[PDB]
Structures are given as C-alpha cells and as structure tokens.
C-alpha cells in the first residue's frame, strides 16, 4: 500500500550519514594511512572508493527507494529465485547486533568512569595492576601500559578467563551498561522513523562537535605536527604493493556499509522521485571526509605522545578497540583538563556507534515488518522482544571472558558472509534482473539514467572488486587467535556456521522455491526470474 516517509529530507541523510560514520572511521582508517604510504594511501583508497565502494552504496540506496520495501520483500520482488539474498542480508545484520552493542557499552562504561579529578587509568599502583605494568605503551608483550591493564584487568577482567571455553562471572556493571544501550536503542527505534529520524540529529551531529574540539585541542599540543607528519607523509612505494590495494579496497567496502539491508531499508522510506543519486554521493563523501578529519584528531595526539611522553610511534599507532580504549585515553590523562577531554571523547564514541546500531536493527524490523504484517501491526512489542533477546545473549559478552566472545563474532558475524551476500546482490541486479531494467527504474525516479560509468561498475568492476577482497583475503587466512590465545578448533568451526548460516539462505531459498513452483526447469526459471512489477 502506502508506507510512511521521512518526516524531512535531513532525517534520511543524517540517518544514513549516521549509520555509515562509525568507529571504523576512527580506529581503522587513520591507521591504514599510517601503515601504507601515508598520504599516498589516499590514491588506492580513492580509486577503490570510486570503482568499488560507491557503486555498491549507490546501488543499495536506489533499490531500497524504488522497490519501496525492506530487504526480504525487495529481493523477493526483484529476483524471486534470489529472495534468499534478502534473508541472508537481514540475518547477518541480526548476528552483528549481538556483539556490536557491547562496544557502545564499553564506551558508556568509560564515560561513567570518567567523572573524577584523577582518571583511574593513569597510574601503575592500583589493585588490578601487575608488577610488569609500565606507564605508557611498549613493544614488549609481557609488559603492558597502565591504560592497557585498566581496560584488561579492571574493566574487562579478561585476565581471569582461560579462553572462550571459560567465560567466567557476569560483570554486572557491564550488564547494566549494555542494558542502557538497548534502552536508548529502544526509545529511538520505538515508534519508527518518525522519532528515530529525529534522534539521529544528536547522534549523527554530536561526533562532529566533539571531533572539532579535539581537533583543535590536538593540534594545539606540542608534537602534534610530528603526528600529522606520520599520518600523511607520502610514500608511493606502498602503492605498488598488493597488500595496500587490498587494505584500501577492504576498508572502503566495510566503511560504506552495504550488505546489511540497512541502506536498502532506510531508502525505502524515501519519496519515489527524490534524487537518490545526489544523496549517495553526498553521503559517501561525508563518510570519507569524516575518516580523513578523524585521522588528524588521532595522530596529532599520537604525535604529542611520541614527543613529550617518550614512546615509539609504532607502539601507539594501532587499529581497533585498543586505540580508542587504551592509547588515546592515555594521552588525554596527561593533558590539562583531562576529565573534560575524556567525557566528550567517550560520549563521541557512544554516539558514533549508536547511529550504526540503529540502522542495523532497523534493517531487521523493517525487513520483517514488510514480510509479516503481524509484526508491522505491533512494533513496540517486536523490538522489545528482539532487544530482550539481544540483551540476554549479550550477557555472554559481559562475562569475564566476554571479549573472547566479542572477538569471535567480530570475525565470523559477517566477514565473508557479507562479501558473498553483496556479490549476489550485484550479480542479481546487474545480470539476472538486468542493468537496463535497473537503469530504467532510476531514470523514472531521478529523471535521468545512470551513466555508463556506474553500469560498468555494477556489472563488472564491483564483482571483480568484491572477489579481489575475498581471494587475497582468503589466501592470507589464519586460524582465529587473540593475543597468544589460540581459539580451539571447535570455536573456529562454530564461527563458520554463523558465517555460513546466512549465506546458505541464498541457495537454500532458491532450492526451496525452485521446487515449490510447477512447470519444466526452463519455464520455472522464467517464473522465478520475472520481477514483481512486471506481473
């Protein structure tokens, strides 16, 4: 029938900007520049963004708007054979909501811990410390910074877990933290995009205020120029390496967030004739611009540390949670007005992650609401139920061995799941559905057909770009390990279910529906390859 639409155009954009701008923007991108060729990394990064990244991002938004339905239904109406794709994508988003919100919880945890004259992670003399603790980061693994032990031996208590097999006690400060996260998500996603679309105003915009303050604070710091030097100093030697092109391609793909049905779902609330193509480019750019800016926020502080604090740069320049919960707060505590930098820093983290979590959850609620009217009829129940399921299982993430759980999901929730899922999205759209049909759909919406540029990216470049990621990442495969702990064979295989459970939906739904329709093989292919709007 007629679905609701965004209260206003900025509600959509801030929702998409919000979903896309994420912790990866902060902890992975600047590190990738530093790691490969400095400023030169922007060359392979930019090309990968142009040919691979945005075309996928653009695709998902266009489809979501035009078919005016969530992921399950939309792919049902597009290529019924491949309706499984919709299932896969929605399923992947599902698994991720389990481990991802614990990041926001850690953020809230450090925020609550940040009200004080003296930040707890500064020194080495606390009860949780070990004799091997030192004040700042080093390159010897047995000896950890005072900030690393705070996070590890106090906040996480990971030192008390012998592996994933041993989870240990439930930390109720984290259990409480995780709850507050889902409470915030609840009364955000509660009534749908009417309220949700407003909430993103704070959670999308806040990080930029806090990036601004910390960008100034960081640049006014002694040594801050040395940092920018480490961040952006060109070396084009790196550009010649395959590893660099894989890192660029890979960061770009996971940054713009295709494959969760979130872009799809969000756009489905757009007015049919609005210019999505303008939106995809504006949203894309704001996403990468944010990562670029963020790099300065980090490495300015990173330089301050290498200058006044006497640490080797390679020791403090790192990716993932370590940068944000260990390295950066270490610098913050050394500077004047530390408590203020801490509070706004951690709030920025939480508000960086919440928009993302919102969008992912919405990809589910929307996708199911469009398939099962019973769900559509009562939203408040469904999401209360869903988040309750998230909370309960997520307590595994608040145990003492919880990180081991978090890390496991992080790898297998979708690494390869989302890569194939998008690979079928592209192949289905470009070949089975046809590009000329997609293009004709877009011209009807915007007024003009996509250039032959996008059509070549959708039909050829992207899929190649996609398996370029997977192949060069497959050959580099190594069994799951975190920090001298080697995950057991069984836990590894437990992950591959989680990985494969979504992707099988594609051939599984194809198999089921191919055998649920009559006629010959040739004529039941044509039945399942004919789109909903053609009938």
């Amino acid at each position, epitope marked *: 029938d007629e679905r609701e639409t965004w209260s206003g155009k900025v509600d959509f954009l801030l929702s998409v900007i919000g979903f896309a701008v994420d912790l990866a923007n902060v902890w992975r991108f600047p590190y990738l520049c530093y790691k490969n060729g400095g400023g030169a990394f922007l060359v392979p990064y930019g090309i990968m963004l142009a040919v691979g990244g945005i075309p996928l991002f653009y695709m998902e938004l266009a489809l979501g708007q035009h078919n005016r339905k969530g992921a399950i239904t939309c792919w049902g109406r597009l290529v019924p054979l491949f309706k499984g794709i919709g299932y896969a994508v929605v399923l992947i988003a599902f698994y991720v909501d389990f481990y991802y919100n614990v990041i926001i919880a850690w953020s809230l945890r450090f925020f609550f811990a940040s009200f004080t004259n003296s930040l707890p992670w500064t020194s080495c003399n606390n009860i949780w410390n070990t004799p091997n603790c030192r004040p700042f980061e080093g390159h010897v693994e047995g000896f950890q910074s005072a900030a690393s032990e705070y996070f590890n031996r106090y906040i996480l208590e990971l030192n008390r877990s012998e592996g994933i097999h041993d989870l240990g006690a439930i930390k109720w400060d984290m259990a409480l933290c995780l709850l507050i996260v889902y409470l915030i998500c609840y009364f955000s996603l509660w009534k749908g995009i009417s309220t949700s679309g407003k909430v993103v105003w704070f959670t999308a915009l806040f990080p930029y205020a806090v990036l601004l303050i910390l960008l100034i604070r960081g640049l006014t710091l002694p040594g801050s120029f040395l940092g920018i030097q480490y961040y952006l100093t060109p070396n084009f030697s790196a550009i010649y390496k395959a590893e660099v092109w894989v890192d660029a391609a890979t960061q770009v793909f996971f940054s713009l967030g295709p494959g969760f049905g979130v872009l799809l779902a969000y756009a489905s609330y757009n007015k049919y004739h609005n210019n999505v193509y303008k939106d995809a480019l504006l949203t894309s750019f704001i996403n990468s611009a944010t990562s670029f800016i963020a790099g300065f926020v980090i490495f300015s502080v990173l330089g301050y540390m290498a200058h006044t604090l006497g640490v080797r740069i390679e020791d403090v320049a790192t990716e993932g949670p370590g940068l944000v919960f260990v390295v950066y707060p270490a610098a913050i505590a050394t500077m004047p007005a530390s408590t203020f930098w801490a509070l706004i820093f951690f709030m920025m983290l939480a508000t960086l992650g919440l928009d993302s979590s919102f969008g992912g959850s919405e990809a589910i609620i929307t996708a199911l609401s469009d398939e099962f009217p019973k769900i559509k009829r009562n939203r408040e129940l469904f999401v209360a139920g869903l988040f309750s399921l998230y909370f309960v299982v997520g307590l595994a993430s608040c145990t003492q061995g919880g990180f081991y759980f978090f890390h496991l999901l992080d790898r297998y929730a979708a690494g390869y799941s989302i890569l194939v899922a998008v690979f079928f999205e592209a192949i289905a759209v470009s070949w089975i559905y046809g590009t*000329n*049909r997609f293009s*004709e759909d877009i*011209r009807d919406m915007i*007024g*003009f057909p996509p250039g032959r540029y996008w059509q070549v990216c959708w039909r050829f470049v992207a899929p190649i770009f996609l398996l370029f990621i997977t192949v060069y990442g497959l050959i580099g495969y190594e069994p799951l390990t975190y920090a001298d702990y080697v995950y057991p064979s069984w836990a590894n295989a437990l992950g591959w279910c989680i990985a494969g459970s979504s992707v099988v939906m594609i051939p599984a739904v194809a198999i089921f529906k191919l055998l649920s329709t009559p006629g010959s093989l040739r004529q039941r292919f044509t039945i399942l390859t004919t789109p909903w709007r053609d009938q």
Partner: antibody
Amino acid sequence: EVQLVESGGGLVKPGGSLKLSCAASGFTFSSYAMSWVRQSPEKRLEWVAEISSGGRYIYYSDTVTGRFTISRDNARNILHLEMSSLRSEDTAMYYCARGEVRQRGFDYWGQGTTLTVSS
Amino acid sequence: ENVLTQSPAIMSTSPGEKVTMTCRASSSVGSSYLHWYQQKSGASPKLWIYSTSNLASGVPARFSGSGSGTSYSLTISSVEAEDAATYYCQQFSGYPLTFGSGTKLEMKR
C-alpha cells in the same frame, strides 16, 4: 545522424480508430524514452504519452487517457500510438519526440504525421 | 496540469535589437526541468534551451535563458532575421508534461 520518421494518419471518421508509427534510426533506440507530442491546427503544442526505454513506465495526458495506447518495438526500432474512439479535437500533426533525460527535454523530433478527424 | 503562459503572444523586432520573452507557470517548476523550443514556420520544433540556462547543440551564443520558480525568460541579445520563429517553453518537472502558449518573433521593417 539521428532520424525519426512518423507515419500513418490521415482522415478518420469520429469515433473511429487509427495507428501511428515512428521509425527510429541513428541511435540505440532501446536506450531512450520517447513521447508523442501533437500540434493542433491552432498551433498549440500538447504532450500526449511517454514510454520508457523498456516501456515499463507509461504516462498519458488526461485528455487522451484510456483511448490512446503507446507501445514500443525495440527489435525493429519502431514507436507506436494506437488511438481509439477518436474525437474531432484529436486533430493535429503528431510528432514523435525523443527524450530520456527529463532535465534535457526533447532533443530530437520527427517531421510529423497529420491526423484529421472529421465526419 | 501545470499551465505555462508566455508573453508576449506576438512581438516584432528590428535586427540587432534585444528581445525578451517570459514564461510563467501556474505552479513552481525546478530550474532543471524548464526547457525552450524554437519552431520555424512550416517545420518541426527544435530543442533550444534546456535546464533553463543551457544552449542546445547548434544554438548561437546570442541566445540565453534564465529564471526560477514560476517565472522564466528567454533572451536574444542581438537578433537576426534568421531568428524569426515561434518559441515554446516546456516543463519536464511533472506529469502531464506541458508546453507554454508560445511567443511569435517577427521581424520589423
């Protein structure tokens, strides 16, 4: 290079029906939405119907809606307008016009073909 | 329908003089969807200006166009007798598509 040629059309009794064709050449005809624009003897330009590249999207003016049917042959590169229960007010020269990008308007027009509706 | 009215209906001009014609829509039109056609006597229309300011292929630089919302105009800076024709404006903004009432440019002598 790009040529558009309308044909069909002539005298028809009121209430009758008739079928116009536009022969396209000089470009991939499948890549372009087309429209029929007509000009009355009083020289008023009026748009009639538009058909997409793959002819999955079709728009009509209110004046001709339900009597006229626009169609497309992408193999033979032809454009069609099938008119029924014609009225005197449908008298006009009929123009086959090509435009795909709305922001660019109609970038090529045919010579036209004349339809006269009189008892 | 969005009705586009043009003025004047007819106008005469001596070559070299500057001519201006206006187009007024009953409802607002995005400047990207407003176009202009020149039709010479006894021949078929030709796309002249598109997206309100843009000259089509083959259009002399002495032509220009401007406007927004409900009011647009086509302008010939220095007229040539070659320019005597009827000018139509069109909006591709919404269906049904509509052409303005036209302006007949005739030469003065």
